[PDB]
Amino acid sequence: GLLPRVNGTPPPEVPLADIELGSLEFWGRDDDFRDGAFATLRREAPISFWPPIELAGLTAGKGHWALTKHDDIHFASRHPEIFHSSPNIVIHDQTPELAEYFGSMIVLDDPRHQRLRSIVSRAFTPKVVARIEASVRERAHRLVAAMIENHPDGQADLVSELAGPLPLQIICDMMGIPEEDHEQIFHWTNVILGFGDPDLTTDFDEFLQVSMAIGGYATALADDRRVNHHGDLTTSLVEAEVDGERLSSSEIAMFFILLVVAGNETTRNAISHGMLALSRYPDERAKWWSDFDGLAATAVEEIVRWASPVVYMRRTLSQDVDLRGTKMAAGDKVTLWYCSANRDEEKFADPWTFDVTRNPNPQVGFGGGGAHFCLGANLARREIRVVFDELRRQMPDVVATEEPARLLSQFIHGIKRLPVAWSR
């Protein structure tokens, strides 16, 4: 909240010769500089080739074509046969023998992708979903109420106390994980998530051990449900079937490992950026708090467009492609910069305005559409809606009180800490 900002302010004009998408220094600049770089790219070099970020001492891989236009990103997403998701969806995979272990369906192309996603989807039965919906409400209500008891001074970090724990507690609830086990699930998850942070010194040996441990935890959980039926997603996964194919315990473990990353830190960063935007632009909070259920759908969609928690996804070309007269070769990597498509001057009027009533809103924060479209998009929209509903009811004047501590990442639009304050 700290620095005053006027809703609708465009980014500074960033000279093309100043943009270094392969430098880590670039990803450390503030959001205005980044938004201004991509604005320059959309105008002057909308498809361009970049080397990967190189951490001195480690293999970096080959470079990538940056797609910065909403129409280009949509096209790529609609043609998975040309733009493959296998081998992986990050610029450079550091553990390629474990690509499928961590990635589950997101690193598969068809037909393997559709087969797996079909079986996983059918496990989300009406009963399992109704339990998830009660969990979202219960968990958000308890976490906000805990912030109030744990902080008589009326100050806390939104990330550690709410935005961090809510998405993971909800994943634990749908898997049927006991309360007692959360500590270990959280510690393992945090170590996995930390392995990308260059402000942390995370041991690769430790990363492997926690990765195997959470996977062994998950296969044992699924095996328990094979003998003991419960009303949880774990049991629905072991029982689900499509054309006679069922899921092994290892496949369920890999999907769980994907959830505690892809379904977790994404939602966390949508919540934190949503809090930050509602703090910077208080008229939007006032409007939202005045008609909460009636503006919730457009408000949530704008929080996702604004936050773009997933900054990009990578693809790999199976054949040559010429689009916008830019020739890209089979085998090249391509990156889909959702953070740029969600400011594309050709799709959104007033793109620099955070508008909780915005409509239409063809935002691509859940991806550009198609085969890999976020499996949890409606679950994420619900988590966002419900957490701000509980803040609105319990501490309506809560506001960010400091600029965020930002995660240094090319992939995740991360907030590490976000101080907030409220009154009673």
Nearest distance from residue 334's CB to ligand HEM, in Å?
12
- When binding is defined by CB under 6 A, the residue of 88, 169, 266, 363 that contacts ligand HEM is 266
Among positions 86-125, residues that touch ligand HEM (CB under 6 A) are 105-106, 117
Segment interacting with ligand HEM, rule: CB under 6 A, options 40-48, 201-209, 254-262, 327-335: 254-262
260 touches 185 (CB < 8 A): yes
For 202-268, where are the E strands, in sequence order? Answer: none
Distance CA 43, CA 273 (A): 26
When the beta carbons of 41 and 254 are compared against ligand HEM, the nearer one is 254
When the beta carbons of 328 and 379 are compared against ligand HEM, the nearer one is 379
When the beta carbons of 247 and 262 are compared against ligand HEM, the nearer one is 262
* Degrees, nearest 5: CA angle 316-322-326: 95
Q: Considering only CA atoms, which of 404, 396, 420 is closest in space to residue 153?
A: 420
365 near ligand HEM, judged by CB under 6 A: yes
Segment interacting with ligand HEM, rule: CB under 6 A, options 4-12, 192-200, 217-225, 376-384: 376-384
312 touches 305 (CB < 8 A): no
Segment interacting with ligand HEM, rule: CB under 6 A, options 65-73, 261-269, 327-335, 341-349: 261-269
192 near ligand HEM, judged by CB under 6 A: no
Distance CA 190, CA 150 (A): 22
Establish whether 374 is an annotated binding residue. Answer: yes
Segment interacting with ligand HEM, rule: CB under 6 A, options 55-63, 217-225, 362-370, 387-395: 362-370
- When binding is defined by CB under 6 A, the residue of 366, 388, 411, 422 that contacts ligand HEM is 366
Nearest distance from residue 307's CB to ligand HEM, in Å?
7
What is the identity of the amino acid at 320? D
327 touches 65 (CB < 8 A): no
5 touches 406 (CB < 8 A): no
Provide the Cα torsion 247, 251, 252, 254; round to 10°: -160
164 near ligand HEM, judged by CB under 6 A: no
Q: Considering only CA atoms, which of 2, 32, 4, 9 is closest in space to residue 400?
A: 2
- When binding is defined by CB under 6 A, the residue of 263, 404, 414, 419 that contacts ligand HEM is 263
CA-CA distances (angstroms) from residue 185 to 104, 145, 217?
18, 23, 9
Segment interacting with ligand HEM, rule: CB under 6 A, options 3-11, 14-22, 265-273, 274-282: 265-273
317 touches 46 (CB < 8 A): no
When the beta carbons of 81 and 203 are compared against ligand HEM, the nearer one is 81
339 touches 47 (CB < 8 A): no
**CB nearest ligand HEM: which residue?**
376
- When binding is defined by CB under 6 A, the residue of 214, 372, 390, 411 that contacts ligand HEM is 372
**Residue 328: in which H helix or E strand, if any?**
strand 326-328
Q: Considering only CA atoms, which of 173, 177, 174 is closest in space to residue 224?
A: 177
- When binding is defined by CB under 6 A, the residue of 270, 277, 412, 418 that contacts ligand HEM is 270
Segment interacting with ligand HEM, rule: CB under 6 A, options 209-217, 241-249, 287-295, 361-369: 361-369
When the beta carbons of 344 and 422 are compared against ligand HEM, the nearer one is 344
Residues 6+ apart with CB under 8 A from 62: 52, 332, 333
- When binding is defined by CB under 6 A, the residue of 41, 253, 262, 275 that contacts ligand HEM is 262
Q: How many CA atoms lie within 13 A of 413 on its CB side?
A: 29
When the beta carbons of 14 and 344 are compared against ligand HEM, the nearer one is 344
Q: What string of H, E and C letters represents the secondary structure of 31-83?
A: HHHHHHHHHHHHHHCCEEEECCCCCCCCCCCCCEEEECCHHHHHHHHCCCCCE
Q: Considering only CA atoms, which of 251, 325, 318, 261 is closest in space to residue 76?
A: 318
**Residue 158: in which H helix or E strand, if any?**
helix 158-158
Establish whether 315 is an annotated binding residue. Answer: yes
Establish whether 113 is an annotated binding residue. Answer: yes
- When binding is defined by CB under 6 A, the residue of 37, 50, 65, 77 that contacts ligand HEM is 77
Among positions 275-314, residues that touch ligand HEM (CB under 6 A) are 304, 309-310, 313
Residues annotated as binding site?
113, 117, 315, 372, 374
Residues annotated as binding site for heme b?
113, 117, 315, 372, 374
List residues binding ligand HEM (CB under 6 A).
Answer: 77, 105-106, 117, 171, 258-259, 262-263, 266-267, 270, 304, 309-310, 313, 365-368, 370, 372-376, 379-380
